[PDB]
Amino acid sequence: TQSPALIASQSSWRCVQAHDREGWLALMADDVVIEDPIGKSVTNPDGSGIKGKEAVGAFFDTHIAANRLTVTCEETFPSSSPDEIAHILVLHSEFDGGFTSEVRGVFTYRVNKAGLITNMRGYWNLDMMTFGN
Amino acid sequence: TQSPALIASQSSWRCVQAHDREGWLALMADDVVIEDPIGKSVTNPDGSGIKGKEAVGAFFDTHIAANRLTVTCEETFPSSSPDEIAHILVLHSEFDGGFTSEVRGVFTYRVNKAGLITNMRGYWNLDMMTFGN
Numbered sequence: 001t002q003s004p005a006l007i008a009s010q011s012s013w014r015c016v017q018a019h020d021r022e023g024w025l026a027l028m029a030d031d032v033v034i035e036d037p038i039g040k041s042v043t044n045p046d047g048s049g050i051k052g053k054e055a056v057g058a059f060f061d062t063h064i065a066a067n068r069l070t071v072t073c074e075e076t077f078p079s080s081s082p083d084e085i086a087h088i089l090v091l092h093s094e095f096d097g098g099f100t101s102e103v104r105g106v107f108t109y110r111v112n113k114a115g116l117i118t119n120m121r122g123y124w125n126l127d128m129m130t131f132g133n
Numbered sequence: 134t135q136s137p138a139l140i141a142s143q144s145s146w147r148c149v150q151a152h153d154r155e156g157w158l159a160l161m162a163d164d165v166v167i168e169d170p171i172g173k174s175v176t177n178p179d180g181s182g183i184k185g186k187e188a189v190g191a192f193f194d195t196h197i198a199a200n201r202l203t204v205t206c207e208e209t210f211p212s213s214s215p216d217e218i219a220h221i222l223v224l225h226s227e228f229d230g231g232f233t234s235e236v237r238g239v240f241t242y243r244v245n246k247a248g249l250i251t252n253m254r255g256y257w258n259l260d261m262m263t264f265g266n
């Protein structure tokens with residue numbers, strides 16, 4: 001059977017693809033910190049991550065839903081802990097009325113013993129993005 | 134110019150390739166924690182990482198030098214922080230008198246403001262290894 005980390009990460013993309021804000025939030029621990037990406041960027045404006053379920057809900061609204069984000073898993077790297085995993089993901093989204101951008105990055109996930117996501121951290125930056133339209 | 138994280142990670146493999154224990158240790162913060170891999174494994178026997186420069190020195194001796202470890206960078210994923218970076222690395226080593234094993238994993242690095250490595254964390258497990266001889 002699949003690890004709690006693999007379940008949580010695969011579920012998180014499934015909820016993105018299903019446009020399911022409630023289902024996505026239900027995967028998150030109360031003390032979740034989302035660093036997508038790690039360091040200061042449009043989607044991490046203060047550089048220290050988006051903290052707690054309310055603010056992460058606003059993050060879903062603006063940076064997953066309103067931008068038509070799609071998430072594709074290219075490759076998966078289990079660790080030796082059932083609660084931590086990494087993936088190469090390709091992110092595609094839309095901006096400024098339908099222009100497109102894409103980025104390929106490493107994303108790490110940690111879950112607690114209950115299986116809820118405590119950390120999602122992305123290794124990318126705006127300079128890595130490629131564009132379309 | 135290159136980020137402190139990229140410098141520290143590239144330097145760490147250079148020191149491995151140069152068989153340079155002193156140079157490798159000098160890259161590490163006093164509070165370094167090496168989780169290679171994250172979770173319990175032969176190279177992380179208690180599952181919580183190898184902590185501090187003395188124990189990480191013993192780690193170099195047994196699990197880098199005595200096993201003829203080579204480290205190859207396949208791909209690099211900068212974040213939006215100059216102090217955190219991820220790479221896909223291929224590790225090759227020897228055991229039981231010259232039989233070989235190899236593993237391909239995601240490795241994350243964090244440096245402090247001084248540029249010293251505080252965390253190196255690997256996403257792999259024994260089940261991912263491939264063998265030779």
Ligand SMILES: NC(=O)c1cccnc1
Nearest residue numbers: 009012013016036071107
């Ligand atoms: N797994 C996720 O829910 C995810 C990954 C990358 C960006 N946004 C959301």
Ligand SMILES: NC(=O)c1cccnc1
Nearest residue numbers: 142145146149169204240
């Ligand atoms: N970068 C390093 O010094 C390193 C990476 C993976 C395993 N051992 C050492």
